[PDB]
Design an enzyme around this catalytic site. Structure first.
Site, PDB file in Angstrom:
ATOM      1  N   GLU A  93     -28.097  34.977 -25.283  1.00 54.03           N
ATOM      2  CA  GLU A  93     -28.455  35.545 -23.994  1.00 54.03           C
ATOM      3  C   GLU A  93     -27.406  36.542 -23.516  1.00 54.03           C
ATOM      4  O   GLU A  93     -26.203  36.272 -23.559  1.00 54.03           O
ATOM      5  CB  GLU A  93     -28.619  34.408 -22.981  1.00 54.03           C
ATOM      6  CG  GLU A  93     -29.145  34.837 -21.626  1.00 54.03           C
ATOM      7  CD  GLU A  93     -29.003  33.743 -20.572  1.00 54.03           C
ATOM      8  OE1 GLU A  93     -29.107  32.539 -20.913  1.00 54.03           O
ATOM      9  OE2 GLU A  93     -28.773  34.103 -19.401  1.00 54.03           O
ATOM     10  N   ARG A 101     -18.525  31.828 -22.975  1.00 59.07           N
ATOM     11  CA  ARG A 101     -18.574  31.006 -21.771  1.00 59.07           C
ATOM     12  C   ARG A 101     -17.176  30.890 -21.173  1.00 59.07           C
ATOM     13  O   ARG A 101     -16.305  30.214 -21.729  1.00 59.07           O
ATOM     14  CB  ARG A 101     -19.144  29.625 -22.084  1.00 59.07           C
ATOM     15  CG  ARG A 101     -19.453  28.787 -20.849  1.00 59.07           C
ATOM     16  CD  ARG A 101     -20.191  27.509 -21.215  1.00 59.07           C
ATOM     17  NE  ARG A 101     -21.400  27.787 -21.983  1.00 59.07           N
ATOM     18  CZ  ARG A 101     -22.510  28.305 -21.472  1.00 59.07           C
ATOM     19  NH1 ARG A 101     -22.597  28.624 -20.187  1.00 59.07           N
ATOM     20  NH2 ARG A 101     -23.554  28.515 -22.271  1.00 59.07           N
ATOM     21  N   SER A 133     -30.465  38.152 -17.768  1.00 57.88           N
ATOM     22  CA  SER A 133     -31.511  37.349 -17.154  1.00 57.88           C
ATOM     23  C   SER A 133     -32.041  38.136 -15.968  1.00 57.88           C
ATOM     24  O   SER A 133     -31.278  38.427 -15.038  1.00 57.88           O
ATOM     25  CB  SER A 133     -30.945  36.003 -16.718  1.00 57.88           C
ATOM     26  OG  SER A 133     -31.960  35.063 -16.520  1.00 57.88           O
ATOM     27  N   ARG A 154     -17.123  30.914 -12.246  1.00 55.44           N
ATOM     28  CA  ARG A 154     -17.996  29.754 -12.407  1.00 55.44           C
ATOM     29  C   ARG A 154     -17.187  28.570 -12.894  1.00 55.44           C
ATOM     30  O   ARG A 154     -16.391  28.697 -13.826  1.00 55.44           O
ATOM     31  CB  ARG A 154     -19.149  30.045 -13.375  1.00 55.44           C
ATOM     32  CG  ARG A 154     -19.963  31.235 -12.928  1.00 55.44           C
ATOM     33  CD  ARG A 154     -21.289  31.372 -13.654  1.00 55.44           C
ATOM     34  NE  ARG A 154     -22.013  32.530 -13.135  1.00 55.44           N
ATOM     35  CZ  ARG A 154     -23.268  32.829 -13.433  1.00 55.44           C
ATOM     36  NH1 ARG A 154     -23.996  32.057 -14.226  1.00 55.44           N
ATOM     37  NH2 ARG A 154     -23.808  33.929 -12.922  1.00 55.44           N
ATOM     38  N   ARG A 159     -20.077  39.468 -22.829  1.00 55.99           N
ATOM     39  CA  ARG A 159     -20.950  39.211 -23.970  1.00 55.99           C
ATOM     40  C   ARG A 159     -21.370  40.499 -24.658  1.00 55.99           C
ATOM     41  O   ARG A 159     -21.575  40.499 -25.872  1.00 55.99           O
ATOM     42  CB  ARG A 159     -22.176  38.415 -23.526  1.00 55.99           C
ATOM     43  CG  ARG A 159     -21.830  36.985 -23.129  1.00 55.99           C
ATOM     44  CD  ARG A 159     -23.052  36.130 -22.927  1.00 55.99           C
ATOM     45  NE  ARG A 159     -22.673  34.769 -22.582  1.00 55.99           N
ATOM     46  CZ  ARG A 159     -23.529  33.764 -22.439  1.00 55.99           C
ATOM     47  NH1 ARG A 159     -24.827  33.926 -22.636  1.00 55.99           N
ATOM     48  NH2 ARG A 159     -23.067  32.563 -22.103  1.00 55.99           N
TER      49      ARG A 159
HETATM   50  N1  LIG Z   1     -19.734  31.327 -18.021  1.00 52.00           N
HETATM   51  C1  LIG Z   1     -20.103  32.544 -18.495  1.00 52.00           C
HETATM   52  N2  LIG Z   1     -19.242  33.279 -19.236  1.00 52.00           N
HETATM   53  C2  LIG Z   1     -19.586  34.497 -19.679  1.00 52.00           C
HETATM   54  N3  LIG Z   1     -20.792  35.033 -19.422  1.00 52.00           N
HETATM   55  C3  LIG Z   1     -21.692  34.331 -18.692  1.00 52.00           C
HETATM   56  C4  LIG Z   1     -21.362  33.068 -18.221  1.00 52.00           C
HETATM   57  N4  LIG Z   1     -22.424  32.613 -17.529  1.00 52.00           N
HETATM   58  C5  LIG Z   1     -23.380  33.556 -17.571  1.00 52.00           C
HETATM   59  N5  LIG Z   1     -22.941  34.602 -18.291  1.00 52.00           N
HETATM   60  C6  LIG Z   1     -23.682  35.848 -18.568  1.00 52.00           C
HETATM   61  O1  LIG Z   1     -24.139  36.378 -17.343  1.00 52.00           O
HETATM   62  C7  LIG Z   1     -25.570  36.561 -17.386  1.00 52.00           C
HETATM   63  C8  LIG Z   1     -26.157  36.346 -16.010  1.00 52.00           C
HETATM   64  O2  LIG Z   1     -26.022  34.988 -15.605  1.00 52.00           O
HETATM   65  S1  LIG Z   1     -27.219  34.227 -14.940  1.00 52.00           S
HETATM   66  O3  LIG Z   1     -26.687  33.079 -14.299  1.00 52.00           O
HETATM   67  O4  LIG Z   1     -28.118  33.801 -15.970  1.00 52.00           O
HETATM   68  N6  LIG Z   1     -28.052  35.182 -13.948  1.00 52.00           N
HETATM   69  C9  LIG Z   1     -27.486  35.753 -12.884  1.00 52.00           C
HETATM   70  O5  LIG Z   1     -26.322  35.521 -12.530  1.00 52.00           O
HETATM   71  C10 LIG Z   1     -28.355  36.739 -12.144  1.00 52.00           C
HETATM   72  N7  LIG Z   1     -27.656  37.226 -10.946  1.00 52.00           N
HETATM   73  C11 LIG Z   1     -28.680  37.924 -13.063  1.00 52.00           C
HETATM   74  O6  LIG Z   1     -27.475  38.613 -13.444  1.00 52.00           O
HETATM   75  C12 LIG Z   1     -26.030  35.592 -18.463  1.00 52.00           C
HETATM   76  O7  LIG Z   1     -27.264  35.985 -19.008  1.00 52.00           O
HETATM   77  C13 LIG Z   1     -24.896  35.644 -19.478  1.00 52.00           C
HETATM   78  O8  LIG Z   1     -25.027  36.800 -20.299  1.00 52.00           O
HETATM   79 MG   LIG Z   2     -28.918  31.760 -17.734  1.00 49.47          MG
END
Ligand SMILES: Nc1ncnc2c1ncn2[C@@H]1O[C@H](COS(=O)(=O)NC(=O)[C@@H](N)CO)[C@@H](O)[C@H]1O
Ligand SMILES: [Mg+2]
Ligand SMILES: Nc1ncnc2c1ncn2[C@@H]1O[C@H](COS(=O)(=O)NC(=O)[C@@H](N)CO)[C@@H](O)[C@H]1O
Ligand SMILES: [Mg+2]
Lengths: 368, 359
Positions: B284, B212, B287, B197, B326
């Site tokens: 969080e 993050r 999700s 990301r 996490r």
């Molecule tokens: N940049 C990041 N770094 C570390 N963990 C992250 C990051 N972004 C999201 N996450 C973790 O990944 C989970 C899922 O991300 S989400 O965008 O909310 N949802 C999805 O991607 C859906 N496909 C469900 O998994 C989050 O709840 C968080 O625990």
């Molecule tokens: Mg989210």
């Protein structure tokens, strides 16, 4: 890169060694030696490496096991994978493109079990430290291990991120050798802390430019494959012995899985860019009726260490010198899956689960 | 994308539901978010999310709490500076026993979902093409959230790839263009992948640690179900993610997101937030979303009754079970001891060669 002093004081000796691997050093240009040509020159072969032109001059050192005799029709790993709904190449085309795969179910679980068995073996019994590494790396890192400047077209490169102050030119790693070896970039290491032994399980990404035609179907040659890598950082005088040790670690994987193989030493003409000496391990693939490369183990001498200026220091005098680096596959996971599927297939189309993998697969004895 | 019949016959109803999530409805159809379900609370941002329940009680510490970065550095197990040298900021190198616990977490989750919860395991590509990104909704609007690769010079027209931001993208697209017998539903898939990301517009948010990152591991759950079963399947899937936290003995709370905080493609989302001692709050960790027929319409994923021949759109659902980085933070901080050692949760010890403590 090579020692610039050797290019100064022995241009003849150097041009001759490089000729043995098929590389002509423009002596005229050699005196000048401007730009980045010094970074395009391959490593010098060790004296004991056989001289030769291509893979036909490679030399077999030993082998282990005998290929099994089949009293039924031998099926290849694609036929077996598809009839158990475990390999799906068409789905991978739909998601992405050619030379990718989707694995499902028990075959996906066996692919996972192989990586876990390898990682546990090397960390619990062979003394390697486990690492989780970035799968994207920067330009300095790729220069450090030699992928740049010459092999940029072998890599996947990312575009810059659409943002204010982001200017990141990253490449996807073609092997964990790149990030693991660069962990000591710019470091000066106490000789008493050597050897450093590291392992990692990563995906590996390769453009496979100019390899089209060869291995068009199956898992042998992909844009993405999993590999468990071994790397060692060692004193200069220990590196040839460490190569024998590291190659033995990879052989132990094949033996515990019961896969017949052979060990070859590459000739000067078939060696890779950064190696001074390389052993390949080739595993028996029944459906191709031959051995195929499954691991490559190399002594890199001080070639990467010089680009990285990774040094060690003795406890007596405070003098420093370049370390040596080594890398080897233990093993490429996708090609190991191919070898297990074809060597352990049964007459009824089921695949016997090798004994050492059953604990990683909840006791399962057969696929299918 | 939304049903075009619905936009014709009922522009009023549609524009009103979209107003609830802050979208003013005057190729453009592909920029419109999903319709929220009726039971979703109306709200503007995360301050209007609604807590549904909790499980477990945060542990009380009789010493000063260390965060996961400090703990990682004393055990030489998290090394952020090495990652900057290899790559850049927002990457990490993990070493030794901490690396092994990160690996053990993913194996425990994968084994649980495939052996107990009925999910089929998959190994998927980590690069995908644009049709796939359109299918699950990341394109056209969220191109800037992704790393994109340069085309390969020998596949110049067909190799505009992107690195996956979540295994939701490849897994859900496995049914793209398919007609599925209703008797073969539900389809339950899981995968463990890295996730990439760009984290655009997030400079400053959680600048320290593993919360993050540009790269992180996640075990993803996806279900393809009959349209009448999707609200029940969401409850089932959210409970699969809760079981992971329960077996690890981690306190958490379950919230339902309001209209204004939901993601583009969801009609209903539960978040699970885990207790993080050094932040004295819940963060969080998962999700879980019902996506209704929003992705299925872009993908033309359909099912057929055996009785007649008519087809209809399936529903799709996705949820984290869990985000592994996490979870490692939560395990490290909630199981730390006073001397700095970290107790290995009981359920992970078979995956760590019997190890009882880190350090
Ligand atoms: N940049 C990041 N770094 C570390 N963990 C992250 C990051 N972004 C999201 N996450 C973790 O990944 C989970 C899922 O991300 S989400 O965008 O909310 N949802 C999805 O991607 C859906 N496909 C469900 O998994 C989050 O709840 C968080 O625990
Ligand atoms: Mg989210
Ligand atoms: N495109 C590919 N697809 C599948 N497997 C591959 C591919 N390229 C290489 N391999 C496997 O990965 C092994 C290691 O590749 S290598 O380039 O020869 N050597 C290295 O990368 C060194 N870092 C040692 O691992 C090979 O021996 C082969 O078994
Ligand atoms: Mg090779």
């Amino acid at each position: 890169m090579l020692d610039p002093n050797l290019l100064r004081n022995e241009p003849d000796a150097v041009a001759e060694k490089l000729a043995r691997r098929g590389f002509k050093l423009d002596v005229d240009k050699l005196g000048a030696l401007e730009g980045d040509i010094a970074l395009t020159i391959p490593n010098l072969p060790a004296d004991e490496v056989p001289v030769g032109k291509d893979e036909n001059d490679n030399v077999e050192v030993s082998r282990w096991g005998t290929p099994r005799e089949f009293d039924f029709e031998v099926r290849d790993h694609v036929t077996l994978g598809e009839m158990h709904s475990g390999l799906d190449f068409a789905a991978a085309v739909k998601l992405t493109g050619s030379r990718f795969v989707v694995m499902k179910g028990q075959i996906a679980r066996m692919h996972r079990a192989l990586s876990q068995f390898m990682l546990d073996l090397h960390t619990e019994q062979h003394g390697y430290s486990e690492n989780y590494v970035p799968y994207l790396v920067n330009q300095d890192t790729l220069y450090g291990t030699g992928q740049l400047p010459k092999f940029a077209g072998d890599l996947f490169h990312t575009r810059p991120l659409e943002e204010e102050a982001d200017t990141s030119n990253y490449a996807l790693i073609p092997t964990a050798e790149v990030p693991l070896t660069n962990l000591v970039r710019g470091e000066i290491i106490d000789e008493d802390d050597l050897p450093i032994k590291m392992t990692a399980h990563t995906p590996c990404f390769r453009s496979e430019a100019g390899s089209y035609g060869r291995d068009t179907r199956g898992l042998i040659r992909m844009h993405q494959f999993d590999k468990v890598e071994m790397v060692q950082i060692v004193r200069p005088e220990d590196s040839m012995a460490a190569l024998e040790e590291m190659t033995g670690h990879a052989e132990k994987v094949l033996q515990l899985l019961g896969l017949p193989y052979r060990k070859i030493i590459l000739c000067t003409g078939d060696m890779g860019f950064g190696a001074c000496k390389t052993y390949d391990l080739e595993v028996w693939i029944p459906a191709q009726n031959t051995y195929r490369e499954i691991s490559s183990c190399s002594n890199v001498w001080d070639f990467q260490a010089r680009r990285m200026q990774a040094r060690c220091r003795s406890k007596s005098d405070k003098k420093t010198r370049l370390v040596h680096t080594l890398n080897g596959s233990g093993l490429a996971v996708g090609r190991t899956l191919v070898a297990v599927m074809e060597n352990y297939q049964q007459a009824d189309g089921r695949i016997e689960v090798p004994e050492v993998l059953r604990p990683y697969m909840n006791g399962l004895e057969y696929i299918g």
